[PDB]
Design brief:
Two copies of one chain form a homodimer. Chain A has helices at residues 5-19, 23-28, 38-71, 78-91, 94-103, 109-134, 149-164, 166-174, 179-184, 190-223, 230-243, 246-254, 260-290, 292-295, 307-330, 335-351, 353-365. With 367 residues, chain A is an all-alpha fold. Chain A has 17 helices and no strands. The interface between A and B is large, with 67 and 68 residues. The complex binds 2-phenylpyridin-4-amine (A1AB0). 2-phenylpyridin-4-amine sits between chains A (9, 12-13, 16-17, 154, 157-158, 161-162) and B (9, 12-13, 16-17, 154, 157-158, 161-162). The PDB classes it as membrane protein.
Chain lengths: 367, 367
């Protein structure tokens, strides 16, 4: 008999790493062709984004299946650990096979490989469940559609950590100035190179800040949750999938815009991405409020002490993004500045969210 | 009052991601120049490896400092969460600053940036501890040099997951055949492209298998540990640092060798890397046996039921790597085949480790 907490955490980390692979090309796509070749570049970017979304959804489905399989198996063992490692190895091939299918649909080989991989995952799961059943003491006490809070929390943390640090990873990978390049192009001055590369640092700053605040809201929301239903899991997975686009949005926004209208469009895209990312969390919290009796703790129940605080925490980002999106069309002159100042305002509001909520209560109550 | 388990897990994931950044160039270095330019390529690879080791050690030190800081702080809050996010953001800049220092030592700016970043991390930690002290109820109950098992386990799992899936990440990133390339170069046949790219798949297979078995041994060892001392933490960090070289070793080994002696040298390098990775785990287990009374559970005590099983689990890899390294010089003709068959033999022994240990006991007892 062995505890499965560490094993399940490792499996969640592996699944989170695998799910977030196809984002890497998307962030590595050239910023601007500079030769007004927008057509092909946009088509390639759209295809990559669609492929990434599809693989993320498929890996999420596989992760949910694994979570259920190990939920019906209470305990673990060395043989079960080896079988879990094998299952993770088989699952890891899904993104590459899906990409091979998508880019080369005409050939009948990619679909064959995908079917083989799915059948292999099924076989590993069948072997795991059979081994567990052959030994009754390794099964769950009850047996021997709620989800598990720990698995969802670990997957969300892994996804958020991967998304937040992507830009810094790329910067460390490729944004190290070369000696002779600095000597010749920039008159042998490092400060010039740092100034040139600053926009990437600003984009990383913004992306990391936004992702960190979103993760903080996610953690605050999930702390006060007792039971996680399948609908909440689906909404959380959708929110995580839409979160992966934040680095791309910030890279596009921070990049120099040829014309002001291009900057307005980039800000609109970033605002839409943020709104989509946060509205799913809001919707999942409403789905939890639907039956707090079986979902939330008494503290965050209707009329609770922290009910309004949680409302504000989960509505700060959606509402602000909506106002920014509206201003992008209402004023159309300070929209870029509005987004820039909002990027610094939202963290301040989150830090002072308690005092701001108290002031809002004081002013609305006697208004 | 809020629980810090999720927050500490997220911090550990971020720190593990940051620590394992500089490995990415190392695995992305060109396999063979093909123009007998071994000098410059080898110098660049050695410099990259040294930089990676240094950054990993520095990030490990920072992670240990953070672990102590949050150990003296029992509970967390929204303000503490924001401060932790800020501290992680400041820490994330360490690898890039260290690289800037190393590549450009002559200029006095990289050292200034590194000092500024270290001072910033110190300032964030000071602010965190001051805020915690200002509110007594947020401090640890005892206050209001053992380590934490959970933090070490999470960091190890993150590092292992990152290392294992690096090769598949690269394959998905860059190893997707192009339509016209297949049409023209390979006579429009996808099977030819897959056969050409197979060596990378084999290298990923080997690396993932080895890393997974090493992680399984790590989990089995750490399950039976009550208290983790600083020496065990240092040994585990050294083992993790040396584990990061496995993908590079497997990439070099699977790559076509110009001459047989090159293949022998590559196998020697891979065997040495594996031996270094596993000997540190063995040494840390011996350091735990030093005072099992305060370190291990009674089950794995001297003369315990699982003592010999754990001995075999932790000595299978070191001993086998030592025999392979010896054979690389003794026979010098089947060394490559010896390594290839060992790669498949070791997982089988691990799977049947219980039965193999029983047979070994039966044969040694009455021998
Ligand atoms: N996608 C990742 C990358 C690195 N680490 C993790 C992780 C680590 C510990 C617990 C949960 C998740 C996830």
């Amino acid at each position: 008999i062995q505890c499965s907490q560490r094993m399940l955490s490792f499996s969640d980390a592996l699944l989170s790493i695998i799910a977030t692979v196809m984002i890497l090309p998307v962030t590595h796509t050239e910023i601007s062709p500079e030769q007004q070749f927008d057509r092909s570049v946009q088509r390639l970017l759209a295809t990559r984004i669609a492929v990434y979304l599809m693989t993320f959804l498929i890996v999420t489905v596989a992760w949910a299946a694994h979570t259920r399989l190990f939920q019906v198996v209470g305990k673990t063992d060395d043989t079960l650990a080896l079988l879990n490692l094998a299952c993770m190895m088989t699952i890891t091939f899904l993104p590459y096979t899906f990409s091979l299918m998508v880019t080369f649909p005409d050939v009948p080989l990619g679909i064959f490989l995908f079917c083989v991989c799915v059948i292999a995952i099924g076989v590993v799961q069948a072997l795991i469940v059979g081994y567990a059943f052959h030994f009754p003491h390794l099964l769950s006490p009850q047996i021997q559609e709620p989800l598990s809070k720990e698995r969802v929390e670990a997957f969300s943390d892994g996804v958020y950590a991967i998304v937040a640090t992507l830009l810094i990873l790329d910067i460390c990978e490729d944004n190290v100035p070369d000696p002779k390049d600095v000597k010749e192009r920039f008159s042998g001055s490092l400060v010039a190179a740092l100034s040139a590369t600053g926009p990437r640092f600003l984009a990383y700053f913004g992306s990391f800040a936004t992702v960190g605040l979103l993760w903080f809201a996610h953690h605050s929301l999930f702390l006060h949750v007792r039971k996680a239903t399948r609908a909440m899991g689906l909404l959380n997975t959708l929110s995580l999938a839409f979160v992966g686009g934040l680095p791309l949005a910030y890279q596009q926004t921070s990049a120099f815009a040829r014309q002001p209208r291009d900057e307005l469009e980039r800000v609109r895209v970033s605002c839409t991405i943020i709104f989509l990312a946060s509205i799913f969390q809001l919707a999942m919290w409403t789905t939890a409020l639907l039956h707090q009796a079986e979902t939330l703790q008494p503290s965050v129940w209707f009329g609770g002490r922290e009910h309004v605080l949680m409302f504000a925490k989960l509505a700060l980002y959606p509402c602000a993004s909506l106002l920014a999106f509206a201003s992008t069309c209402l004023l159309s002159r300070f929209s870029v500045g509005i987004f820039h100042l909002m990027q610094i305002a939202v963290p301040c509001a989150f830090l002072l969210l308690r005092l701001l909520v108290g002031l809002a209560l004081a002013t609305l109550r006697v208004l």
